[PDB]
């Protein structure tokens, strides 16, 4: 139908994006190559209308050119309303905001893309801070997001400089609500959200005319708090300075967002960090590397930040700080095999791992196990109203559960093969010590055939000599006797090392939940059929209002919404969590059979060091007698 | 706009899916419910019309219920038409036919997807022919696919049975162009076309008035050809009876399809096997499980096809069929160790293999480097001409083409992920062997050290004795002078073994390709480019014209499509291919090394055992002396 045109440039005003205050952007094409643009029409210009400043400060806005700034290429003037167009460039992919309005992103983004969000805002950020432009207004809104050529997604930045001729409401700052400080605070309240999936300072009715506990909590500031939320209508408020447990984070990532989320969001400047503190300790989080570390003890994974020119000294180090291991009571394996690794090794040359194929740790001393600690999320319940807003809000709520669930029994199913393998290899490691003990028990047996033999023989060929004789035959036997008890107690160990020897891993291929039973591949089917609803849902948001057929399908497709959410979570609990936690009970009756068998083949062992000595002062003793 | 309906259903005649010559299936609605069903209203129906015969014919098929059969659920009355309606099943995800038009599938259905695609059609057919009724018609048109609850795909049949009251032309039985074999023809058509993802007979200019050419093909049925293809406008025939190059299936596979196909392909019932026949030969096929084996001496990877219960001697033997290595020289290493396999050992108890998690095998004998043997295929060229078809017919061939370049590209990355893996067992595994060299290296040491001594000894306490220690004395010179040979020819393998000691894995870490690289993603991304574009054209397609804007529009990507493609390509070859023949030239000199300095371990070895029995004969000597 209608649609406007520019010179080189046509759209229509169907094809809307983004409909801001000042401008409106549509998407357009360019008139003789047929390349999409981005048009940002703007609206309501004529008691401004600089054409003589805003001429130099498009010009410069032009030339300006980063990875992570959305890219102004020209500025036109349509035909008929005359109004000044901005060409810039089309982002396939929406907003952040777009992003986490996905269920799998209801609490939190991947850890992946959430670093790159992190890195590229920061740099587009440093990079407006070095011409002299403040933002202020950065939202998840207004961060754009691209396909790189790569796969990887790129991040870049757009709606600033707007405040000269003329914060949102939940990013504003606790000053500015009715200094650079103003600038970080919105950057905090946006990290926050891509990590946990929901705003910092939450009242319990929301951003209404009931928002005056908002601005309480805000000026509140305790301490280096980074949210606070009410769980009642004006009730107490709920503070933490850690992130939340449905965080799809690792741990070792936490440890240090937590201070800098924590010294950014205050509204005094004399804790506050400047652009330089800020750009400092973020730059470092993103130079650093990913161990991924699979602690056998505990069951659970962790991911190390360890710069690449660091020690292994500060490797041990933080795995203490997140495994609670002595740093001389670590042990690595690796690939089936155990791996010795310098106090000054850098982290440059530690070999390839994943999450998926990490480091193992296993500890002499007897540590609880854990595994993995989660945040158990019901359903929320489905009113019969035909809200087209309540039925959006309430799509988006019960199946980003679903989607946290189903990302729980991923993690789940992987600590159980990762565990079986750790396992696997952990009882042939062993093995490997059972043979080398046996190559030092034939040093010994080596030894005390001969040696006694040689004294043996003396008797026979060639009261003095009896006395010294005997004591010597006895000696050689006090030895031979406990290497007589040895040998056989090392069987019995090599008796529960052999398959049914009460260590096998044969439980572990048993109890828990395996790849065949394809648990998370059913989650997803029921997840896909209620994703699908959700996004059927924002349609029908947008209309406002559906015709009578298009009514009651919404109702039957939001009944069939509870439907598929609780088969799912049935299935789940009753399959997956039950047969997990059966893995984990009897994960720990193995690691105590496992480590009593490791103390007694370390003292069966030091034993034959110990006979290893005594056998040395006896073989030079009568074979080295001195005559002229 | 206009949209039929029944009693209990109600549909669109916009909402279409096929369109058949005695009916037309819609997507239709349950009025109450609101679950959706194919609704099947019967075009001309007046000359027959047996409301006798059918209808309790289609009461039989309506109890007829099996998971690789579409359901039939009534037989209902239009309203106003009065057409005979039946209401079946709806298969959300198309027909197999919908499949193949995937470019992914241009060159063959995945592996995985074809057993599905065969155990499926089988399954259901079987269930058929044991209700007595002949389809003849099997075609990937007329089965569809559904999504299972456990994310598995699963096929099912529809159209048969109307041949009652009354082949498609490129599955026509040769006799039947102008018995049971009539059947399995057009089901070998149909397997071959899943596998190849083209069709088995195929004259120059295809199916229209010069298909006077493919009768003669079909009615040649040279031996057990399974397809014959003429390259040139009314030329020769090239006759195979084997599977492509740019087949995606496993090389294990292959043999046992050949057979199949090639003995139900023939006009002639002597040679044409039966129902049980075909069903035996291939239930066989689909009960077998899947070895992963990954030979580095060829560097190819190998599904070997074998049963449950038999043995590692069958098991040897396919390997042999497909590797070309004696039983007797396949060595397997699994995790970082070798193992040992006995000869009676069934495949139940065999450890889990994946494709990227296989049983590697090494082999004493020189055998040269294959790698990945892959059909190289160029792009075609793009004609200038607005044919909406021909500009369809060419987005699905010139993005089939990158699929299968991304295909090997990501086989190619696999190789050398496990080529890495492979090697860096492999000298932690030969280094085992030299660990265990050095302990019977001191087993002959202690025995050397202690024999000499008593000897030496006796000569200092205590014409004739004097010319037997001599001799002795010679002896115990003869060996130990050559275990100091050995000693310090095995530090010069041990600094072979040392990094940087010439046999290090550090060239395969460089030459080669990374998933850093993220190659196999950069070329995903131009590919889902042309993708969307070919998906476009079908809709342009459908339309059979198009509007001024729409038509620019459509000239504009399908100039983009072929800059896709050859930027995909030149990225395929300058960056994949090179640097993995680089890699794989580099992977010869290692292999060459690494057997070389394998021989000269061996030996060093035996001699230790060959010095072995010559210390037994003299430790036993001397200190044996016979006297009363
Ligand atoms: O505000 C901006 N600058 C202000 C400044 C001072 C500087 C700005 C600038 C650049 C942008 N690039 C975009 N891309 C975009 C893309 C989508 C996704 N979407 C794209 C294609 N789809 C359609 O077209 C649908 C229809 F209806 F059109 F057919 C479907 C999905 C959604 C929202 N945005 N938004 C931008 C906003
Ligand atoms: O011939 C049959 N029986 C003959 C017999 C004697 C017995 C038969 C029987 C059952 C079937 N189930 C289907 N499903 C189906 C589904 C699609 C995919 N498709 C579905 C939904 N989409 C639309 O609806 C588009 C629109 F336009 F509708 F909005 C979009 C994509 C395409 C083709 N088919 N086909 C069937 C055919």
Same mark, same amino acid.
């Given at each position: 139908?209608?649609?406007?045109?520019?010179?080189?440039?046509?759209?229509?005003?169907?094809?809307?994006?983004?409909?801001?205050?000042?401008?409106?952007?549509?998407?357009?094409?360019?008139?003789?190559?047929?390349?999409?643009?981005?048009?940002?029409?703007?609206?309501?210009?004529?008691?401004?209308?600089?054409?003589?400043?805003?001429?130099?400060?498009?010009?410069?806005?032009?030339?300006?050119?980063?990875?992570?700034?959305?890219?102004?290429?020209?500025?036109?003037?349509?035909?008929?309303?005359?109004?000044?167009?901005?060409?810039?460039?089309?982002?396939?992919?929406?907003?952040?905001?777009?992003?986490?309005?996905?269920?799998?992103?209801?609490?939190?983004?991947?850890?992946?893309?959430?670093?790159?969000?992190?890195?590229?805002?920061?740099?587009?950020?440093?990079?407006?801070?070095?011409?002299?432009?403040?933002?202020?207004?950065?939202?998840?809104?207004?961060?754009?997001?691209?396909?790189?050529?790569?796969?990887?997604?790129?991040?870049?930045?757009?709606?600033?400089?707007?405040?000269?001729?003329?914060?949102?409401?939940?990013?504003?700052?606790?000053?500015?609500?009715?200094?650079?400080?103003?600038?970080?605070?919105?950057?905090?309240?946006?990290?926050?959200?891509?990590?946990?999936?929901?705003?910092?300072?939450?009242?319990?009715?929301?951003?209404?005319?009931?928002?005056?506990?908002?601005?309480?909590?805000?000026?509140?500031?305790?301490?280096?708090?980074?949210?606070?939320?009410?769980?009642?209508?004006?009730?107490?408020?709920?503070?933490?300075?850690?992130?939340?447990?449905?965080?799809?984070?690792?741990?070792?990532?936490?440890?240090?967002?937590?201070?800098?989320?924590?010294?950014?969001?205050?509204?005094?400047?004399?804790?506050?960090?400047?652009?330089?503190?800020?750009?400092?300790?973020?730059?470092?989080?993103?130079?650093?590397?990913?161990?991924?570390?699979?602690?056998?003890?505990?069951?659970?994974?962790?991911?190390?930040?360890?710069?690449?020119?660091?020690?292994?000294?500060?490797?041990?180090?933080?795995?203490?700080?997140?495994?609670?291991?002595?740093?001389?009571?670590?042990?690595?394996?690796?690939?089936?095999?155990?791996?010795?690794?310098?106090?000054?090794?850098?982290?440059?040359?530690?070999?390839?791992?994943?999450?998926?194929?990490?480091?193992?740790?296993?500890?002499?001393?007897?540590?609880?196990?854990?595994?993995?600690?989660?945040?158990?999320?019901?359903?929320?319940?489905?009113?019969?109203?035909?809200?087209?807003?309540?039925?959006?809000?309430?799509?988006?709520?019960?199946?980003?559960?679903?989607?946290?669930?189903?990302?729980?029994?991923?993690?789940?199913?992987?600590?159980?093969?990762?565990?079986?393998?750790?396992?696997?290899?952990?009882?042939?490691?062993?093995?490997?010590?059972?043979?080398?003990?046996?190559?030092?028990?034939? &040093?010994?047996?080596?030894? $005390?055939?001969? %040696?006694?033999?040689? #004294?043996?023989?003396?008797? /026979?060929?060639?009261? !003095? @000599?009896?006395?010294?004789?005997?004591?010597?035959?006895?000696?050689?036997?006090?030895?031979?006797?406990?290497?007589?008890?040895?040998?056989?107690?090392?069987?019995?160990?090599?008796?529960?090392?052999?398959?049914?020897?009460?260590?096998?891993?044969?439980?572990?291929?048993?109890?828990?939940?395996?790849?065949?039973?394809?648990?998370? &591949?059913?989650?997803?089917? $029921?997840?896909? %059929?209620?994703?699908? #609803?959700?996004?059927?849902? /924002?349609?029908?948001? !947008? @209309?406002?209002?559906?015709?009578?057929?298009?009514?009651?399908?919404?109702?039957?497709?939001?009944?069939?919404?509870?439907?598929?959410?609780?088969?799912?979570?049935?299935?789940?609990?009753?399959?997956?969590?039950?047969?997990?936690?059966?893995?984990?009970?009897?994960?720990?009756?193995?690691?105590?059979?496992?480590?009593?068998?490791?103390?007694?083949?370390?003292? $069966?062992?030091?034993?034959?060091?110990? #006979?290893?000595?005594?056998?040395?002062?006896?073989?030079?003793?009568?074979?080295?007698?001195?005559?002229?």
């Amino acid at each position: 139908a209608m649609g406007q045109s520019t010179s080189n440039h046509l759209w229509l005003l169907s094809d809307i994006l983004g409909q801001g205050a000042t401008a409106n952007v549509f998407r357009g094409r360019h008139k003789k190559t047929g390349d999409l643009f981005a048009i940002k029409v703007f609206n309501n210009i004529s008691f401004l209308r600089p054409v003589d400043v805003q001429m130099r400060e498009f010009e410069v806005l032009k030339k300006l050119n980063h990875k992570n700034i959305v890219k102004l290429f020209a500025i036109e003037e349509e035909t008929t309303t005359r109004h000044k167009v901005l060409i810039m460039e089309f982002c396939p992919c929406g907003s952040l905001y777009t992003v986490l309005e996905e269920p799998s992103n209801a609490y939190g983004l991947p850890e992946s893309e959430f670093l790159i969000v992190l890195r590229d805002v920061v740099g587009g950020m440093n990079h407006l801070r070095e011409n002299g432009i403040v933002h202020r207004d950065i939202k998840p809104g207004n961060i754009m997001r691209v396909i790189g050529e790569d796969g990887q997604s790129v991040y870049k930045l757009t709606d600033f400089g707007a405040a000269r001729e003329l914060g949102t409401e939940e990013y504003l700052h606790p000053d500015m609500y009715e200094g650079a400080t103003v600038d970080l605070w919105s950057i905090g309240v946006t990290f926050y959200h891509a990590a946990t999936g929901s705003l910092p300072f939450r009242p319990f009715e929301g951003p209404r005319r009931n928002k005056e506990v908002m601005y309480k909590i805000i000026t509140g500031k305790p301490s280096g708090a980074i949210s606070g939320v009410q769980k009642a209508e004006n009730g107490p408020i709920d503070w933490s300075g850690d992130m939340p447990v449905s965080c799809s984070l690792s741990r070792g990532l936490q440890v240090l967002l937590t201070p800098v989320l924590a010294n950014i969001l205050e509204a005094d400047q004399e804790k506050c960090w400047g652009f330089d503190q800020f750009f400092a300790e973020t730059s470092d989080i993103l130079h650093r590397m990913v161990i991924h570390v699979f602690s056998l003890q505990q069951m659970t994974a962790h991911k190390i930040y360890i710069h690449s020119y660091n020690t292994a000294t500060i490797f041990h180090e933080l795995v203490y700080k997140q495994t609670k291991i002595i740093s001389s009571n670590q042990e690595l394996i690796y690939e089936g095999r155990r791996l010795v690794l310098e106090p000054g090794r850098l982290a440059q040359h530690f070999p390839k791992t994943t999450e998926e194929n990490p480091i193992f740790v296993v500890s002499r001393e007897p540590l609880n196990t854990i595994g993995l600690i989660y945040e158990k999320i019901s359903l929320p319940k489905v009113h019969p109203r035909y809200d087209l807003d309540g039925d959006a809000s309430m799509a988006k709520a019960i199946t980003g559960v679903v989607c946290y669930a189903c990302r729980i029994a991923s993690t789940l199913l992987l600590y159980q093969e990762l565990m079986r393998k750790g396992i696997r290899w952990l009882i042939e490691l062993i093995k490997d010590d059972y043979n080398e003990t046996v190559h030092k028990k034939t &040093e010994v047996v080596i030894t $005390l055939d001969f %040696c006694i033999r040689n #004294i043996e023989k003396t008797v /026979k060929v060639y009261a !003095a @000599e009896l006395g010294e004789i005997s004591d010597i035959h006895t000696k050689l036997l006090r030895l031979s006797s406990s290497q007589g008890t040895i040998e056989t107690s090392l069987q019995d160990i090599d008796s529960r090392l052999s398959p049914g020897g009460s260590l096998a891993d044969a439980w572990a291929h048993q109890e828990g939940t395996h790849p065949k039973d394809r648990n998370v &591949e059913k989650l997803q089917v $029921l997840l896909n %059929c209620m994703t699908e #609803i959700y996004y059927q849902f /924002k349609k029908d948001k !947008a @209309e406002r209002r559906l015709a009578y057929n298009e009514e009651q399908i919404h109702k039957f497709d939001k009944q069939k919404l509870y439907y598929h959410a609780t088969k799912a979570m049935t299935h789940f609990t009753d399959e997956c969590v039950k047969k997990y936690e059966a893995f984990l009970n009897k994960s720990e009756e193995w690691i105590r059979k496992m480590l009593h068998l490791r103390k007694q083949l370390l003292s $069966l062992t030091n034993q034959c060091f110990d #006979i290893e000595e005594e056998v040395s002062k006896y073989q030079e003793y009568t074979n080295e007698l001195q005559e002229t």
